[PDB]
Amino acid sequence: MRIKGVVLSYRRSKENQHNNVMIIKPLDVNSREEASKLIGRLVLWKSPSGKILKGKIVRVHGTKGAVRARFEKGLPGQALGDYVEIVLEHH
């Protein structure tokens, strides 16, 4: 299963762990429960660089089902409105 989402916003990782954060609103996930069972799942975002960065849903945002994912590559984008695919990893 891959869930389709819209990156509402990005956050520049100023931390030691340079993992580019994003406020994703999954079109299928509009409940807190459906979002909370996605903690750890692998999000595939398409960077403007023409690369598919892999990320991890670290925590959800409210009851809206909007998930917040940190991407290992930590590469910028500012592609506000771009689409992701949340791979139901389940480790």
Neighbours of 39 (CB within 10 A): 13
Query: By what technique were these coordinates determined?
Result: NMR
Contacts of 44 (CB under 8 A, 6+ apart): 2, 52, 53, 54, 55, 84, 85, 86, 87
- Cα–Cα distance list, 7 to 16, 34, 85, 91 (Å): 23, 18, 11, 24
CATH number of residue 72's parent domain: 2.40.10.190
How remote is the C-alpha of 19 from its chain's centroid? 11
Cβ(13)–Cβ(32) under 8 Å? no
Q: Residue 69 in 3-state DSSP?
A: strand
**φ, ψ (nearest 5 deg) of residue 20:** -65, 120
Output the six-digit token pair for 54: 């892999």
Domain count, the chain: 1
Cβ(33)–Cβ(82) under 8 Å? no
Structural domain that includes position 20: 1-91
